[PDB]
Nucleic acid binder design. Structure first.
Ligand SMILES: [Mg+2]
Ligand SMILES: [Mg+2]
Ligand SMILES: [Mg+2]
Ligand SMILES: [Mg+2]
Ligand SMILES: [Mg+2]
Ligand SMILES: [Mg+2]
Ligand SMILES: [Mg+2]
Ligand SMILES: [Mg+2]
Ligand SMILES: [Mg+2]
Ligand SMILES: [Mg+2]
Ligand SMILES: [Mg+2]
Ligand SMILES: [Mg+2]
Ligand SMILES: [Mg+2]
Ligand SMILES: [Mg+2]
Ligand SMILES: [Mg+2]
Ligand SMILES: [Mg+2]
Ligand SMILES: [Mg+2]
Ligand SMILES: [Mg+2]
Ligand SMILES: [Mg+2]
Ligand SMILES: [Mg+2]
Ligand SMILES: [Mg+2]
Ligand SMILES: [Mg+2]
Ligand SMILES: [Mg+2]
Ligand SMILES: [Mg+2]
Ligand SMILES: [Mg+2]
Ligand SMILES: [Mg+2]
Ligand SMILES: [Mg+2]
Ligand SMILES: [Mg+2]
Ligand SMILES: [Mg+2]
Ligand SMILES: [Mg+2]
Ligand SMILES: [Mg+2]
Ligand SMILES: [Mg+2]
Ligand SMILES: [Mg+2]
Ligand SMILES: [Mg+2]
Ligand SMILES: [Mg+2]
Ligand SMILES: [Mg+2]
Ligand SMILES: [Mg+2]
Ligand SMILES: [Mg+2]
Ligand SMILES: [Mg+2]
Ligand SMILES: [Mg+2]
Ligand SMILES: [Mg+2]
Ligand SMILES: [Mg+2]
Ligand SMILES: [Mg+2]
Ligand SMILES: [Zn+2]
Lengths: 97, 204, 126, 81, 151, 60, 100
RNA sequence: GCGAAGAACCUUACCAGGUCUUGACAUCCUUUGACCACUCUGGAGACAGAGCUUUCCCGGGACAAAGUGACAGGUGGUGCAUGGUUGUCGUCAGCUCGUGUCGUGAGAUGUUGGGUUAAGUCCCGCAACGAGCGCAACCCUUGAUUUUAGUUGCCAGCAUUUAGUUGGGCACUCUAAAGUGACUGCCGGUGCAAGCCGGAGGAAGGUGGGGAUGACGUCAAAUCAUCAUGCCCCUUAUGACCUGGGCUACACACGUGCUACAAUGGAUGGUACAAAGGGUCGCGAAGCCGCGAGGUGGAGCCAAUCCCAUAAAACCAUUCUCAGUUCGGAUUGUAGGCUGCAACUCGCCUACAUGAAGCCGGAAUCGCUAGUAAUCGUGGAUCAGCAUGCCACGGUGAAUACGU
């Protein structure tokens, strides 16, 4: 009955914890739906390159955010406290329902 | 032409950025207090030869890892200086702080340390022609794959500014499987300002 | 009742072939209404024209993306692929006519300092 | 305020003009509030308005009401090329 | 350009009339990528041509085109003189290019009403060696034959 | 007049419409992004050193 | 007719300087039957050691005249810049006439 | 259409008037220790005069004041004294070194000669043998496909609803992680090799398309005004505060753009198809009101859920009849709307009226090789409000390249 949203700046770091959640959930007997990759959100920042002049020369940076989604439909309290007391590496954002 | 910063190109491919936290709606506050912490740490441990600092945020807490080549002079007599830093940072940041030290082996494979050593040497009225190659010799006998240094400015006290560079080994700057470390430092002399730029190509 | 998927530009069409008369339906609408103009209709029929199979199948399609021309090409590719799906024998005729290749032509990125994708600002020498 | 909320006049000028309601009328009102609109209460009075470097005098006549004071105190000096 | 000859782009034959030159004509009356306007103003022309004349529209189009395509054409270049207008034989492909270019550059200027007509009575005029485009071809042929020595 | 300008900018103005923004490292008033509260120079030089999380050079 | 845009860096443009530049550059009209309408552009700089530099650009119909010269005096630089410009004029005229 | 990714006040650095002096900003000594706030009167405001407190917090700290001093403070000068950053030649293919050898010497070879290519790319030859920085490859994106994953995404096969709505399913698109895939690999000819031409299979064939990437160095190129710094200069002012103006002037000249000069059109009514983005001091729907810009209202939303946001060209009907007009919209008079303490100099928009130049533009000159040029819209940064500018996204979508 719980929905978990995981979002981070790097997919490699993200997916390790994303899976760690699903194993730590289903090991204690939980019916869980696998991660669903939601669309990433990328934003662009264009800044002039020079200090004074030269508008014709620029440089563009980007920041892209990745997202996941986990569902559990028939939890048990053991799954609840296992997920809650489990700690993820800093760099991800977890929003437990 | 103009070369792109050799760390800017390799962030997100093979290198990694320092500040490792995700945040929104309060991004600016975290970023600016991180810059404040960085400056506060940098201007105090000048003699301690600090290379890299990492800030790791987690739920109203800060976890800072400091990399040094002389860890003993960073830790206090039993951890007194570390405790003083922790309490001062607690006062400044207004949230729980925690600090860790990671020692560095082969302090000749960190471009920042070599740059700042050459900077102090040039401040001590030493000939750049000797300091550059001295640093090159230490770094290559350390086991490095390539090294290149340059020094620019009012060279040797002259009236006209110029630049001089020495390189040896191999430094492929257009390869993205590089693992190249870059650093730039300022030597403030009685004749003005000089800039030292050192960058190193490591193995594997 | 055999599937097929066609893409062109920024348009995707899901086509499916049923044996039958040949009535053409697009997105719960009739082929004469959804694409009204007469000459934008022979594009879909070409896969059914390069082989004499004009009235041997009814098409059911679901399309989205792009303008009226682009989804015509998408649905053309889709019906051709579906035709190969029904019968694994029609490949030489269509591959010979170049009716299987997906169009790799896409709208091109803009570029900073340029007024378009390749247009440059005016300059003077007098 | 160019809406129907109401006109606009700075209180430090409205106070002066309505306190100059006496028959004496010999108090030329000096002001910097160029942006204040002209009320019918201004009729008769004489107002020096700052135009950047000096207070120029304006005599509030009947048909001048409704406008803004800064209109009658030009701020550029043009004579010809 | 500088490296070598470059392949052309084949023109897919039009529907309805099922020809090649008709599509290349539609592509020439196009302005700003408006395919529909040109298509309509050409199909209206080839319908009113049958309404007025009584013949197959494509026959009138072909027997009017055969009179416009030039053969010789003057090129200013070296060989035989430094830009002395040497007359040369236009290639097989260049014919229809010039024919359609002249057919449309003059159908824009006839000037009675909507161009949906201006193109039709120019094909009729070209069907019997009269008008302006045919005059252009005749003038070009005269100028080419003038320099019968520089070849 | 530079160091007084930062002090004025951090003060509270007479009315809201007089507030504005400057870069935080340097005191530059023009072309400052409100996402980072940095100008276009303290952003370029400091994103190279990998001190802004998430932000990297874009090549698409 | 010639239109002059005169810029002076680290110096103030004074009327006799303008008149001298005008007449010296106007002496360039004698090389054409028809006087052009191009925009002459002049830049004047003075260093700290009393050395003066003058740069001149003229976009003719089918010709571009560029000439920069540095010397101990501004007026001498102007005279030498005029000599350079007429040199380019003669070069271009001879080349185009030879390619008749 | 350059710093300026946005000048009504602020920004603002310029001018006029009114003001201050260890000061608007920091370390630092004495003591009171919370000063601070807030209310009223006077002034354009800075600021003065009163009243209320001061519970500082826990000898230490945060801040303040009072005089107090060493001191600050400069968007003042020189980018020819500098560090950092950037343009350009030019993503052109070059620039050098160690050992060796030739020359009295500066110098020379390697880097020249033959084919070959986008390329000192590759091989052959050789008094040279190797190496380094560049070229190429490693990186991102688009085009095909396999596995796991099915929610807020999709709806073939199942019944219902205002309709993918509701129960139901992840079959197909779709999102995104890991792989496959293109490597002259194979075949035919040529050459002796590098390689060249042709063909096959394939979604894609010869670095597939596009980005990022910018060697030694040239222009004493640009920035002391983003930042930092040497030397000089002002220090009751060249430092600091407040109100009003100015950067928006106007006989003219030059550069970059937008809109037109109409019938491939103007005007009226009907109606269909997108990609990429932004949103909690925020986006803001239905409903009602108003001809209109907009007002009232409050649904949903920390978002594949809700909103901005039923895209415009296009298509189908009607009308106009080649006119300076039912083209064009400038300019101006009146009445309103929104933001903001404030819209006169100096904002954007709306309604009625007015109705200008202009009928394809001399000499000359610019851009573009395919989803390009052309054309039509859409989003974002700066931002209370203000873009015909800048950066991105798609819809329709050509002509020509014989040749140097
Ligand atoms: Mg520009
Ligand atoms: Mg850029
Ligand atoms: Mg460059
Ligand atoms: Mg570009
Ligand atoms: Mg270009
Ligand atoms: Mg400063
Ligand atoms: Mg203020
Ligand atoms: Mg503002
Ligand atoms: Mg600003
Ligand atoms: Mg200068
Ligand atoms: Mg002379
Ligand atoms: Mg002011
Ligand atoms: Mg008081
Ligand atoms: Mg008091
Ligand atoms: Mg000082
Ligand atoms: Mg310079
Ligand atoms: Mg040589
Ligand atoms: Mg190349
Ligand atoms: Mg060679
Ligand atoms: Mg090489
Ligand atoms: Mg749905
Ligand atoms: Mg072979
Ligand atoms: Mg082939
Ligand atoms: Mg490529
Ligand atoms: Mg490369
Ligand atoms: Mg110059
Ligand atoms: Mg200074
Ligand atoms: Mg005084
Ligand atoms: Mg201006
Ligand atoms: Mg009209
Ligand atoms: Mg309509
Ligand atoms: Mg979308
Ligand atoms: Mg919005
Ligand atoms: Mg916005
Ligand atoms: Mg609500
Ligand atoms: Mg919008
Ligand atoms: Mg008519
Ligand atoms: Mg107004
Ligand atoms: Mg006229
Ligand atoms: Mg007319
Ligand atoms: Mg090209
Ligand atoms: Mg090609
Ligand atoms: Mg805005
Ligand atoms: Zn800054």
């Amino acid at each position: 009955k719980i929905r978990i949203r995981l979002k981070a700046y790097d997919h490699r770091i993200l997916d390790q914890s994303a899976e760690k959640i699903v194993e730590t959930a289903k090991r204690s007997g939980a019916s869980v739906s696998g991660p669903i990759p939601l669309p990433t959100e990328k934003s662009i920042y264009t800044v002039l390159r020079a200090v004074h002049k030269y508008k014709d020369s620029r440089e563009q940076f980007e920041m892209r955010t990745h997202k996941r989604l986990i569902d559990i439909v028939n939890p048990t309290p053991q799954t609840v406290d296992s997920l809650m007391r489990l700690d993820l590496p800093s760099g991800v954002d977890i929003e437990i329902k | 032409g103009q070369k792109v910063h050799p760390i800017g190109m390799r962030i997100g491919v093979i290198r990694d950025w320092d500040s490792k936290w995700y945040a929104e709606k309060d991004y600016a506050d975290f970023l600016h207090e991180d810059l404040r912490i960085r400056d506060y740490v940098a201007k105090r441990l000048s003699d301690a030869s600090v290379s890299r600092v990492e800030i790791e945020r987690a739920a109203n807490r800060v976890n800072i890892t400091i990399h040094t080549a002389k860890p003993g002079m960073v830790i206090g007599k039993g951890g007194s200086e570390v405790e003083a830093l922790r309490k001062n940072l607690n006062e400044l940041t207004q949230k729980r702080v925690h600090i860790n030290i990671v020692e560095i082996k082969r302090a000749d494979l960190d471009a920042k340390l070599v740059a700042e050593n050459i900077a102090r040497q040039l401040e001590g009225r030493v000939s750049f022609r000797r300091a550059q190659k001295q640093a090159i010799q230490r770094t290559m006998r350390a086991g490095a794959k390539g090294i290149k240094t340059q020094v620019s400015g009012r060279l040797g006290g002259a009236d006209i500014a110029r630049a001089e560079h020495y390189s040896e080994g191999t430094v492929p700057l257009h390869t993205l499987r590089a693992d190249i470390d870059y650093a730039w430092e300022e030597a403030d002399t009685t004749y003005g300002k000089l800039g030292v730029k050192v960058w190193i190509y490591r193995g594997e | 009742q055999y599937y097929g998927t066609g893409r062109r530009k920024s348009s995707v069409a899901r086509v499916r072939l049923v044996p039958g008369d040949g009535k053409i339906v697009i997105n719960n609408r009739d082929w004469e209404d959804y694409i009204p103009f007469a000459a934008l209709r022979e594009v879909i029929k070409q896969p059914l024209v390069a082989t004499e199979t004009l009235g041997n199948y009814d098409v059911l399609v679901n399309v989205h993306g792009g303008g009226y021309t682009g989804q015509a090409g998408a649905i053309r590719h889709g019906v051709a692929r579906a035709l190969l799906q029904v019968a694994p024998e029609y490949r030489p005729a269509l591959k010979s006519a170049g009716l299987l290749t997906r169009d790799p032509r896409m709208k091109e990125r803009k570029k900073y300092g340029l007024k378009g994708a390749r247009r440059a600002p005016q300059f003077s020498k007098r | 305020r160019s809406l129907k909320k109401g006109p606009f006049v700075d209180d430090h000028l409205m106070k002066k003009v309505e306190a100059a309601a006496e028959s004496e009328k010999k108090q030329v009102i000096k002001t910097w509030s160029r942006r204040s609109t002209i009320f019918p209460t201004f009729v008769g009075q004489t107002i020096a308005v700052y135009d950047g470097r000096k207070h120029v005098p304006v005599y509030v006549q009947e048909d001048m009401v409704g406008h803004k004071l800064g209109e009658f105190a030009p701020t550029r000096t043009y004579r010809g090329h | 350009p500088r490296k070598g000859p470059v392949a052309k782009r084949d023109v897919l034959p039009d529907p309805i009339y099922n020809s090649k030159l008709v599509t290349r004509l539609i592509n020439k009356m196009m302005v700003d990528g408006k395919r529909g306007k040109s298509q309509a103003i050409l199909y209206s022309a080839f319908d009113i041509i049958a309404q007025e004349t009584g013949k197959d529209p494509m026959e009138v189009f072909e027997q009017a085109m055969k009179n416009i395509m030039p053969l010789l054409e003057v090129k200013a270049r070296r060989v035989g003189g430094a830009n002395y207008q040497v007359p040369i034989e236009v290639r097989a492909d260049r014919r229809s290019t010039l024919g359609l270019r002249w057919l449309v550059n003059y159908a824009r200027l006839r000037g009675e009403k909507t161009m949906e007509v201006r193109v039709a009575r120019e094909i009729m005029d070209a069907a019997n060696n009269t008008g302006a485009s045919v005059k252009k071809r005749e003038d070009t042929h005269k100028m080419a034959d003038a320099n019968r020595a520089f070849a | 007049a530079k160091k007084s300008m930062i002090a004025k900018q951090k003060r509270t103005p007479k009315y809201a419409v007089q507030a504005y923004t400057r870069c935080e490292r340097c005191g530059r008033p023009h072309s400052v992004i409100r996402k980072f509260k940095l100008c276009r120079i303290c952003f370029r030089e400091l994103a190279y050193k990998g001190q802004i999380p998430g932000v990297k050079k874009a090549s698409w | 007719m010639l239109k002059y845009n005169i810029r002076g860096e680290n110096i103030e443009v004074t009327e006799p300087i303008r008149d001298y530049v005008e007449k010296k550059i106007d002496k360039l009209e004698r090389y054409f039957t028809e006087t052009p309408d191009a925009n002459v552009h002049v830049n004047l700089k003075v260093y700290s050691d009393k050395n003066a530099k003058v740069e001149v650009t003229i976009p003719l119909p089918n010709l571009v005249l560029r000439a920069e010269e540095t010397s101990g005096d501004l007026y001498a630089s102007i005279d030498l810049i005029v000599d350079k410009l007429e040199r380019q004029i003669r070069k271009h005229k001879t080349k185009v006439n030879r390619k008749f």
